[PDB]
From Swiss-Prot, chain C:
Locations listed in the record: Cell membrane
Function: Forms a receptor-activated non-selective calcium permeant cation channel.
Record note on quaternary structure: Homotetramer. Interacts with ITPR1. Interacts with ITPR3. Interacts with MX1. Interacts with RNF24. Interacts with JPH2; the interaction is involved in maintaining Ca(2+) homeostasis in skeletal muscle and is mediated by JPH2 'Ser-165' phosphorylation.
Disease / disorder: Spinocerebellar ataxia 41: A form of spinocerebellar ataxia, a clinically and genetically heterogeneous group of cerebellar disorders. Patients show progressive incoordination of gait and often poor coordination of hands, speech and eye movements, due to degeneration of the cerebellum with variable involvement of the brainstem and spinal cord.
Record organism: Homo sapiens
Tissues in which the UniProt entry reports expression: Expressed predominantly in brain and at much lower levels in ovary, colon, small intestine, lung, prostate, placenta and testis.
Residue range from the parent sequence: 308 to 461 of 921
Domain statement: The cytoplasmic portion of the protein is required for channel assembly and gating.
Entry protein name: Short transient receptor potential channel 3
Similarity comment text for this entry: Belongs to the transient receptor (TC 1.A.4) family. STrpC subfamily. TRPC3 sub-subfamily.
Length: 487, 150, 140
């Protein structure tokens, strides 16, 4: 079985390398995978299942996951073992409904700090075995990320119904306080989110240093996670810089001028800028950078739910199909870029000379042309974007024709993409989803505490089994072949 | 009473199965509606992600924004929901202040949200095309037989 | 046939419970449903159809509806009985077109209070049998 798995790897690699006889090498790799699956299929006892799943630690399951042997890992003979290991030391929860499991997740989320504090006695405690199970690790991580999302949402509190004060008006706790001190100071929720992000960043840094930057970047989703944390760090660094500037102004104001009120004082313009509202902030202010990057980070923060969905049964194939569609998108989206850039440059060249002449400046510059032709995909761009105030009907008519052709091209490419990635669709979906869920399961087997809480510190019996299994496989294959050729 | 009147015409699902032409019609509609919820959960996830992200971005510009569409939680939800059907204007992410960083990030996030809605819509359509395949005939006859036995 | 139907129920329930060998249990349930359908298929008289459709009141049809045995209930051998019972005490309306049926519905709608008032004498009246039919209940 190991020989067949390594041979499947070699055949897949040679199929990728050759690109001429790719069909033949792929067929040979499928033959090796089918042989492995057939050998696994003939199991009749847990001992034989274990012997196939690892030699003399699910070594063979991990090695098949590495080689993308979907049918060997999604086979019920392996799923029965993976579920027993996954629900280790807590078997009663396996038969409960999804609602009970969600209730368990909520219970863990509510009492996560309490169980984390009690984890010190857990190795000598009965509940430590439960908390060390491969499932309660996943529930702990999921409840942890849900708590992080709740912290992100609750940070934006006091503004759900809108800010009570207009941007043009400054509010100070005391008259001598700088407004930027009031607006840049870290709240306790922000300080907790900072610890949260540093914990996740430390976990990812440890993983990267253990593995290696090259194959770390090779995974697309790990790159997205690292970029998310980097964006969080950049936003908090910009916020910290704004806080430093504000507190420097605060030190200065009490350092030199000694008056009962700050309004009557003619502060130096460098310090006086810190007593301004949003209307007078520089476009490149550190707080503006911080808010923009923090908004991007919050948008990307809810994408970690792709670590939780595969464990579920209903939304597993959902995420698998979404990932397949997203992977199929990029090939068509390159051609989208090509055609979009063609029309964007063509219309920009046409309308660049009518900056003030056009009634609506939508193609006069490169940025407006890009904006208008992008929003034309969703219909949010008005049709009056190609009409002028001058009586140059030639340019206007050519703009109308080019805009119509661009819209027709977008429609044609959209329908072409939809049709092609319908045809590209065809228990393959079932085995693919089970393979993804098995990868998720094996990710937690051997990572005990959540990110924020991780900072704190007579040949052989196996040969006999394999010989029996191979003898059975040979007999079954011969029986099947001769039974189909009895005549 | 208006909500009740809207829901009152839904009882026609008790009359349609007896008919022969509209039986499989209602069966297919029910199958599609059942398939919707699984994708609609992910719709909620992505929609809430972008809704909170844009609300956090634009919450500080209540009076600064030319059109208050993301300044509060309710306006952000309204605008991003109506963006699915195209009824929300593109001028919802442009400010009156010269803070081009926030405005540009809002434009980028809005474009990414629209692209995500398109991608998820096509993914749902393709998946519940593939999920489709006299099975329809026997299913419709079973539903009509349940109606008869009722 | 009852044993096969209960076994199909048990196999479907175990397919839901296990979630590991769900394919095998679903295949076994399909085998039981196919056996039930095949037993129903060999009918050649109304007596045999009735005997399969209920034991010693469409008991087996109801029990198959409860177990989602789609092919046993949608089989023509069962549909012929369900239509005869459905169009009971009014057989001429079965062969009429959809337009005639809609006209009957409109006629009932126009005179619904009148027939409701006359329903007091309906049990002793000829028209009470028509108004008590399984179809005129649906039209009403
Ligand atoms: C690709 C879409 O682009 C567009 O929206 N357009 C392209 C053509 C433009 C235009 C401008 C003008 O001044 N005139 N004057 C006339 C008489 C026509 C005319 C219009 C239609 C036809 C036809 F229907 F027979 F084809 C024949 C002649 C005409 N068209 C309007 C915007
Ligand atoms: C996702 C859709 O989001 C949107 O609608 N946008 C995102 C970008 C925004 C913007 C703002 C600006 O000030 N400028 N200035 C320049 C020079 C560009 C520019 C535009 C396009 C290109 C490209 F076409 F080559 F890619 C290169 C540079 C530009 N863009 C406009 C709104």
């Amino acid at each position: 079985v190991l020989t067949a798995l390594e041979l499947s790897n070699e055949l897949a690699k040679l199929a990728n390398i050759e690109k001429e006889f790719k069909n033949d090498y792929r067929k040979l790799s499928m033959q090796c995978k089918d042989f492995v699956v057939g050998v696994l299929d003939l199991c009749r006892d847990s001992e034989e299942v274990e012997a196939i799943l690892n030699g003399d630690s699910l070594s063979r399951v991990k090695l098949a996951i590495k080689y993308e042997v979907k049918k060997f890992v999604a086979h019920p003979n392996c799923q029965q073992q993976l579920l027993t290991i996954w629900y280790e030391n807590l078997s009663g929860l396996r038969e409960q409904t999804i609602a009970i499991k969600c209730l368990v997740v909520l219970v863990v989320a509510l009492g996560l700090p309490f169980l984390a504090i009690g984890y010190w006695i857990a190795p000598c405690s009965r509940l430590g075995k439960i908390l060390r199970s491969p499932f309660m690790k996943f529930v702990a991580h999921a409840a942890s990320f849900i708590i992080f999302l709740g912290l992100l949402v609750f940070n934006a509190s006091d503004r759900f119904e809108g800010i009570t004060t207009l941007p043009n008006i400054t509010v100070t706790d005391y008259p001598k306080q700088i407004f930027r001190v009031k607006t840049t100071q870290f709240t306790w929720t922000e300080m907790l989110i900072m610890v949260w992000v540093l914990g996740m960043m430390w976990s990812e840094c440890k993983e990267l240093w253990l593995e290696g930057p090259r194959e770390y970047i090779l995974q697309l989703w790990n790159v997205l996670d690292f970029g998310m944390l980097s964006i969080f760090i950049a936003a908090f660094t910009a916020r910290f810089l704004a806080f430093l500037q504000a507190t420097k102004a605060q030190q200065y104001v009490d350092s030199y001028v000694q008056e009962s009120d700050l309004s009557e004082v003619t502060l130096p313009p460098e310090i006086q800028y810190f007593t301004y509202a949003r209307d007078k902030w520089l476009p490149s202010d550190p707080q503006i950078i911080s808010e923009g990057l923090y908004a991007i980070a919050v948008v990307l923060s809810f994408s970690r739910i792709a670590y939780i969905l595969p464990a579920n049964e209903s939304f597993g194939p959902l995420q698998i199909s979404l990932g397949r569609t997203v992977k199929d998108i990029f090939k068509f989206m390159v051609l989208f870029i090509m055609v979009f850039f063609a029309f964007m440059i063509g219309m920009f060249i046409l309308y660049s000379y009518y900056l003030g002449a056009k009634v609506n400046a939508a193609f006069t510059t490169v940025e407006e042309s890009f904006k208008t032709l992008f929003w034309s995909i969703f219909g949010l761009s008005e049709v009056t974007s190609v009409v002028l105030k001058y009586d140059h009907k030639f340019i206007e008519n050519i703009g109308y024709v080019l805009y119509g052709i661009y819209n027709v091209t977008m429609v044609v490419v959209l329908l072409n993409m939809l049709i092609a990635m319908i045809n590209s669709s065809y228990d393959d979906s079932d085995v693919e989803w089970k393979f993804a869920r098995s990868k998720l399961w094996l990710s937690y087997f051997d990572k005990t505490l959540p990110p924020p809480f991780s900072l704190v510190p007579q040949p052989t019996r196996y040969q006999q089994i394999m010989k029996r299994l191979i003898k059975r496989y040979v007999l079954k294959a011969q029986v099947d072949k001769e039974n189909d050729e009895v005549n």
